[PDB]
Amino acid sequence: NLFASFIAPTILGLPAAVLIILFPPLLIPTSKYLINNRLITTQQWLIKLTSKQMMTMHNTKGRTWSLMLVSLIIFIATTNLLGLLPHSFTPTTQLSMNLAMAIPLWAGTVIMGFRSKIKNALAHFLPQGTPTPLIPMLVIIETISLLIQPMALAVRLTANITAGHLLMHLIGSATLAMSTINLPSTLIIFTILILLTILEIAVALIQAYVFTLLVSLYLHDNT
Amino acid sequence: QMSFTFASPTQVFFNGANVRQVDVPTLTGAFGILAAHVPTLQVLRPGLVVVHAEDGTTSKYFVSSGSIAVNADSSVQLLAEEAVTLDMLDLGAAKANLEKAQAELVGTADEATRAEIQIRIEANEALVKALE
Amino acid sequence: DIDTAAKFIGAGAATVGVAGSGAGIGTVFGSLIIGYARNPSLKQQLFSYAILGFALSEAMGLFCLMVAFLILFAM
Amino acid sequence: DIDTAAKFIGAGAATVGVAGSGAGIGTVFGSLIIGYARNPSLKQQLFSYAILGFALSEAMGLFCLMVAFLILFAM
Amino acid sequence: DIDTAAKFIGAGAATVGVAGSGAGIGTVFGSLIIGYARNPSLKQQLFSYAILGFALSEAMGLFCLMVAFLILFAM
Amino acid sequence: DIDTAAKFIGAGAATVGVAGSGAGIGTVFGSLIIGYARNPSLKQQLFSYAILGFALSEAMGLFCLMVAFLILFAM
Amino acid sequence: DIDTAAKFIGAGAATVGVAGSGAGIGTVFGSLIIGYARNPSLKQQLFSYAILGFALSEAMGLFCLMVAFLILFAM
Amino acid sequence: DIDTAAKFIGAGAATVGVAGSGAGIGTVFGSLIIGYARNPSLKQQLFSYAILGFALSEAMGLFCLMVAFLILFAM
Amino acid sequence: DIDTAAKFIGAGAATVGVAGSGAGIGTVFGSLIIGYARNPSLKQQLFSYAILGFALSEAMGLFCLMVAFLILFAM
Amino acid sequence: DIDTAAKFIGAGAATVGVAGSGAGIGTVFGSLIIGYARNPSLKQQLFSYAILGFALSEAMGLFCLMVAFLILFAM
Amino acid sequence: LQSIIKNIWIPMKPYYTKVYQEIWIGMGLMGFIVYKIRAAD
Amino acid sequence: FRSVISYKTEEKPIFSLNTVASADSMSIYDDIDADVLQNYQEYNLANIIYYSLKE
Amino acid sequence: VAYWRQAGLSYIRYSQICAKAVRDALKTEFKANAEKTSGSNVKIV
């Protein structure tokens, strides 16, 4: 009834969700050319900007993931942005997919921090100037924190994009029920809906940059 | 109400002038000064200095070091060691010397000498950032 | 009915989550006053940061009014 | 009745959301004191920002008194 | 009766909204100390801003004691 | 009885409003430390402002212990 | 049913935990204004710290909306 | 019994008033760090003010544990 | 059942304790912005203190999600 | 049973008192960042004050987890 | 088997063999997690 | 230096850090610690030596 | 307390280096006359 926009869409019995997830890349054309059209011009510029804002803090080992992270922020930002389209199915509202993006990358990071670096990795479990009577309690803290990092990653995305879409949908329904009643109030609620859509556009981009920046910071912590 | 005084060992840019606002690069972070501002005294770091005349026009200089002192009678005294207008500087020598100092920093090993490298580094970084 | 009754307490409780945005918005437009008194030449760039903070703060506040109305009417 | 009874708890709970504006308003007019003590020449421009912050803060506070009365009387 | 009983919980809950003014008043008279330590010559003008902030803060606090007594006795 | 029972929840809830003064008092005597470290020659005038803030803060805190005991015993 | 009823109060209560992120987000983007007004040349590095703080703050806020929906629908 | 049951909710609720002292104590010993970093020569006089603030803050916190135990056992 | 029902309210209430970490985390990464804007050369040593504060803050936040799940499932 | 049920609400409510230490700990390790950025030569003496503040803050936080477990199991 | 491993396996081999090694170990940890999830459901 | 014919031997003070910091009338000054008074005193030691040398 | 203060410098020194680097970044039209007006010739004995 209310959560119809989050059910796995099926067209003619076929899983149309496989198309919608494959689509966002179709908006990033590429060219061997050296001077090219406006779309690839701006995109090539943003991808450079993002890669400079994300990969700068990394050492030589960290910047090896520069393809993955820039490809991750470009996919999440395009899925979230496309999701704001009417009647769209936003595959980042799904906990399944977001789990399948947060579990590997978080796991891939801590593993590479545990293969090498294993003595610094276990030492990161205790801050430097930590006093003696407080050592034992502060290790069970972090291991639980470290364990909920991937859960926090996926939930922070699904719960922020879902709540945003549902909210726009509710206020939208209010304007509908208000259409046959006082007209200025309809204009006020509609104005609220307009300002909310702008916020959802800012959240769509921020949630992409947040998901990626947190995977990045995990990467820097283990490289 | 504010009587400004911007000077250098050899040049007096202002003297008891009545301006409305003054931006300075203090060592404890920048801040802009208007009339009746709380009395303060600070020493500068490399950075711009913008002066807003009452007519709404803005002069921009570049001070290297010195001292600022806003007083109880709304009288400001800004004394820079080396004050140059922005157009007397070039970006190439700024970026060039920034690299040389960055090169000498990774190369150096002594604490005191390294600080003098860093001091010259931040000297240039504020140059390129203030220029363009 | 015990369901129609519990909907009033549940929708009333979830509204208390708006108290977080009443305080968070006061801090943003409080720090804008302090931050602008120090560097008034950045007025336009500071205000840009206040609106971003105001929006993100009130965002968490409307998520509560979301549930407050999701329970009162949508259920 | 269980409905007339639950309306008192629900309207009472939603009023706690006013505590957010009691604190948010204290921060605004607290930062106005600090911000004005630093640059008293901006008194008129600072106060303009306090009222804007006071209004937006108390706005979230009256949304709670909205629901508090929407439940107590309008339902 | 379930109504006389729910009036105690509802009036008790709405009183928690006073906690917002207990904190908001501490910030105002806390910033007055900081703001006066910096520019003690503005003591009379700063205090004028503290009372304005104290009043507007406690205003939201008494709106809660309003509902707390509107439910306990007026209903 | 449902009335004697609800009096315990109502008096328990209204006590949470004291949490506002626990935080507001910490801010006052926290700003007194900061404000006195900056201008220690005003120690006697600053402390005068702390007590005024402490009193007005705890005032809102005892209004809650008022209702907490107004419900538990006076009703 | 007493279970379907208690799910509304439980999901309503857990939403109040979002009030913590409404205030925590206001502090981050409030300190960004103050921190940027003092060293505006670090604008890009400061903002990098605000988003990290905004994310970690709202993280605790969505853990509450997690339980709020884990109780309302998943149970 | 409905009385023995309501005593658990009432004593549980009044304990939330300790959250005010958890935050108020953090502000005092937070401002002591800031205030001492400025004027470390006043270390002994600042600390004297922290303990006074710590005591007065936790005072409001134990008034809640008072009622929390006044309800759980003394009634 | 009254036990299966009370488990929803009890697990919902204990989740509100996460609101403390939503605010405490905002203060840490808010003070990191202010502290780094003043001495940006200590960036690596300041951040070391932020993570320590972030961990210890969220530690108290997960102790609540502990009880929230200790009641909902383990009982 | 109404007693076994009320123990869940009472133990759940008393856990909210941990939210006070989540915020108080954020202020301590937030002021340590600010206080250390100003006088980094006092790093060892400042940190000594942070742990003292962290302990005293979390002390009030565990007094709540005390009652939370005193009710859930010891009663 | 032409132009597939020519356009898909060569450009990603630098990534699918040394960079993403820890990613696959994580992806299995994911499949095991979703399997244990969809098992008890 | 007073005129082409007239000059006078004057004298100006030089205050240490502890004098400026412990002054009662330096309380009205703001964002002042014992570090910004060290940098300011030092720079005013070269400002009064330079002023003298030009007179 | 800035880093070079922990190193043992002084604002006279910090100011010399800073005023120096600002003199080098001068364009050559002004670099000569500005190095003359600000050079040092005194010698300790």
| Cβ neighbourhood burial of C45 (10 Å; 0-12, 13-18, 19+) | middle
- Is the CB of J49 inside 8 Å of chain A's CB atoms? no
The answer to whether J17 and H15 are in contact (CB under 8 A) is yes
Residues A154, I29: Cα–Cα separation, whole Å: 22
Give the chain E residue nearest D9 (alpha carbons): E10
List chain D gaps (C–N > 2.5 A) by preceding residue. none
Sorted by where each begins, the domain ranges of chain M are: 1-45
Residues A219, A66: Cα–Cα separation, whole Å: 11
The answer to whether D34 and E27 are in contact (CB under 8 A) is no
Amino acid at A55: M
Q: Provide the β-strand partners of residue L5.
A: none
Q: Provide the β-strand partners of residue B21.
A: B52
Amino acid at A80: N
Task: Look at G53 and I29 and tell me if their CB atoms are within 8 Å.
Answer: yes
Which of B2, B19, B31, B51 to probe the C interface (max C CBs under 10 A)? B31
Q: Which of C6, C30, C65 sits opposite D30 (nearest CB)?
A: C30
- Is the CB of I51 inside 8 Å of chain G's CB atoms? no
Cα-Cα-Cα-Cα torsion A87, A91, A96, A102, nearest 10 degrees, comes to -150
Distance from CA of D28 to the nearest CA of E (A): 8
Task: Look at F18 and H64 and tell me if their CB atoms are within 8 Å.
Answer: yes
The answer to whether B80 and B49 are in contact (CB under 8 A) is yes
Closest Cα partner for G29 from D35, C52, D30? C52
DSSP H32-66: HHHHHHH-GGGHHHHHHHHHHHHHHHHHHHHHHHH
Report DSSP state, residue B77.
Answer: E
Contacts I59 to A, Cβ<8 Å: 138, 141, 145
The answer to whether B102 and B121 are in contact (CB under 8 A) is yes
The answer to whether F46 and F32 are in contact (CB under 8 A) is yes
Task: Look at F22 and H57 and tell me if their CB atoms are within 8 Å.
Answer: yes
Interface list for L 4-33 with B (CB within 8 A): 28-32
Residues I42, I25: Cα–Cα separation, whole Å: 20
**Three-state secondary-structure class, residue B23:** strand
Dihedral sign, CA of F15, I15, G64, G55? Answer: positive
Q: Which of B28, B31, B129 sits opposite G41 (nearest CB)?
A: B129
The answer to whether A138 and I56 are in contact (CB under 8 A) is yes
Q: CA-based angle A213:A215:A221, to the nearest 5?
A: 100
The answer to whether B32 and C41 are in contact (CB under 8 A) is yes
- Across I1-75, the runs of DSSP E, i.e. the strands, are none
Residues D28, D47: Cα–Cα separation, whole Å: 10
Place of tokens 């439940």: D71
Task: Look at H12 and F16 and tell me if their CB atoms are within 8 Å.
Answer: no
Q: Provide the β-strand partners of residue B50.
A: B23, B60
G vs A contact (3+ beta-carbon pairs below 8 A)? yes
- J59: which residues sit within 8 A by CB, 6+ positions away? none
The answer to whether J68 and J32 are in contact (CB under 8 A) is no
What are the phi and psi torsion angles at E73 (to 5°)?
-120, -50
Residues I4, A51: Cα–Cα separation, whole Å: 51
Residue A190 CA from chain centroid, whole number = 28
Which of D33, D36, D58 to probe the E interface (max E CBs under 10 A)? D33
The answer to whether F8 and E6 are in contact (CB under 8 A) is no
Residues A159, C63: Cα–Cα separation, whole Å: 11
Residues B21, B51: Cα–Cα separation, whole Å: 6
Residues C20, D23: Cα–Cα separation, whole Å: 10
The three-state (H, E, C) secondary structure of chain E, written as one string:
CHHHHHHHHHHHHHHHHHHHHHHHHHHHHHHHHHHHHHCHHHHHHHHHHHHHHHHHHHHHHHHHHHHHHHHHCCC
Q: Which of H7, H28, H67 sits opposite F26 (nearest CB)?
A: H28
Closest Cα partner for J22 from A162, I20, A204? I20
If residue K24 lies in a helix (H) or strand (E), which one and from where to where? helix K21-39
- Is the CB of B30 inside 8 Å of chain G's CB atoms? yes
Residues C57, I53: Cα–Cα separation, whole Å: 22
Cα-Cα-Cα-Cα torsion H25, H28, H32, H35, nearest 10 degrees, comes to 160
Task: Look at B28 and I38 and tell me if their CB atoms are within 8 Å.
Answer: yes
The answer to whether A125 and A50 are in contact (CB under 8 A) is no
The answer to whether B76 and B116 are in contact (CB under 8 A) is no
**Three-state secondary-structure class, residue F67:** helix
Residues M4, H17: Cα–Cα separation, whole Å: 48
What are the phi and psi torsion angles at B97 (to 5°)?
-65, -30
Residues E72, F7: Cα–Cα separation, whole Å: 12
The answer to whether I16 and G17 are in contact (CB under 8 A) is yes
Task: Look at B38 and D40 and tell me if their CB atoms are within 8 Å.
Answer: yes
Closest Cα partner for H24 from F27, F35, A70? F27
Contacts A53 to G, Cβ<8 Å: 44, 48
Contacts A145 to I, Cβ<8 Å: 55, 58-59, 62
Q: CA-based angle M22:M24:M28, to the nearest 5?
A: 120
Distance from CA of J13 to the nearest CA of F (A): 10
CA distances from J9 to F9, H14, H62, J15 (A): 11, 12, 21, 10
B vs K contact (3+ beta-carbon pairs below 8 A)? no
The answer to whether I20 and J65 are in contact (CB under 8 A) is no
Which of E2, E4, E8, E58 to probe the F interface (max F CBs under 10 A)? E8
The three-state (H, E, C) secondary structure of chain A, written as one string:
CCHHHHCCCCECCECCHHHHHHCHHHHCCCCCCCCCCHHHHHHHHHHHHHHHHHHCCCCCCHHHHHHHHHHHHHHHHHHHHHHCCCCCCCCCCCHHHHHHHHHHHHHHHHHHHHHCCHHHHHHCCCCCCCCCCCCCHHHHHHHHHHHHHHHHHHHHHHHHHHHHHHHHHHHHHHHHHCCCCCHHHHHHHHHHHHHHHHHHHHHHHHHHHHHHHHHHHHHHHCC
The torsion region of residue A93 among left (phi > 0), alpha (psi -120 to 50) and beta comes to: alpha
Residues I20, J16: Cα–Cα separation, whole Å: 9
The three-state (H, E, C) secondary structure of chain J, written as one string:
CHHHHHHHHHHHHHHHHHHHHHHHHHHHHHHHHHHHHHCHHHHHHHHHHHHHHHHHHHHHHHHHHHHHHHHHCCC
Place of tokens 């006093």: A131
Distance from CA of B43 to the nearest CA of G (A): 15
Closest Cα partner for A101 from A117, A79, A124? A79
Place of tokens 């406690």: E58
Angle, in degrees to the nearest 10, between helices E43-72 and E19-38: 180
How many structural domains is chain J composed of?
A: 1
Q: Provide the β-strand partners of residue B42.
A: B68
| Cβ neighbourhood burial of I48 (10 Å; 0-12, 13-18, 19+) | middle
DSSP C12-58: HHHGGGGHHHHHHHHHHHHHHHHHHHH-GGGHHHHHHHHHHHHHHHH
Residue A173 CA from chain centroid, whole number = 27
Closest Cα partner for J68 from J28, J17, J22? J17
Closest Cα partner for F49 from B48, E33, B61, B34? E33
Residue G70 CA from chain centroid, whole number = 17
Amino acid at I37: A
Residues K40, K36: Cα–Cα separation, whole Å: 6
Angle, in degrees to the nearest 10, between helices C43-72 and G19-38: 180
Distance from CA of H23 to the nearest CA of I (A): 9
| Cβ neighbourhood burial of A177 (10 Å; 0-12, 13-18, 19+) | exposed
- Is the CB of D40 inside 8 Å of chain E's CB atoms? yes
The answer to whether G44 and I37 are in contact (CB under 8 A) is no
If residue B63 lies in a helix (H) or strand (E), which one and from where to where? strand B58-63
Question: How many beta-carbon contacts under 8 Å exist across C and D?
Answer: 151
Q: Which experimental technique did the depositors report for determining this structure?
A: cryo-EM
The torsion region of residue B52 among left (phi > 0), alpha (psi -120 to 50) and beta comes to: beta
Task: Look at I14 and J19 and tell me if their CB atoms are within 8 Å.
Answer: no
| Cβ neighbourhood burial of H73 (10 Å; 0-12, 13-18, 19+) | exposed
CA distances from L50 to B80, L23, M13 (A): 13, 25, 16
Amino acid at H46: L
The answer to whether D17 and G16 are in contact (CB under 8 A) is no
The side-by-side arrangement of strands in the sheet containing B6-7 is B6-7, B76-80, B66-70, B40-43
Those chains having 3 or more beta-carbon pairs within 8 angstroms of chain I are: A, B, G, H, J, M
Task: Look at C39 and B30 and tell me if their CB atoms are within 8 Å.
Answer: yes
End-to-end alpha-carbon separation of chain F, Å? Answer: 14
Amino acid at A85: L
What domain range includes position C47? 2-73
**Three-state secondary-structure class, residue M38:** coil
CATH number for the domain spanning I35: value is 1.20.20.10
Residues B90, B92: Cα–Cα separation, whole Å: 6
H19 HSE (CA, 13 A, CB side)? 34
The overall longest dimension of chain I from CA atoms, in Å, is: 61
Checking M7-14 for CB contacts under 8 A at 24+ apart, the result is: M7/B111, M7/B112, M7/B114, M7/B115, M8/B112, M9/B112, M9/B115, M9/B116, M9/B119, M10/L42, M11/B43, M11/B65, M11/L38, M11/L39, M11/L42, M11/L43, M12/L42, M12/L43, M12/L45, M12/L46, M13/B116, M14/B65, M14/B119, M14/L39
The answer to whether A108 and K25 are in contact (CB under 8 A) is yes
Residues C7, I63: Cα–Cα separation, whole Å: 29
B17-24 vs B47-53, strand pairing mode: antiparallel
Q: Provide the β-strand partners of residue C5.
A: none
Which of F3, F33, F71 to probe the H interface (max H CBs under 10 A)? F33
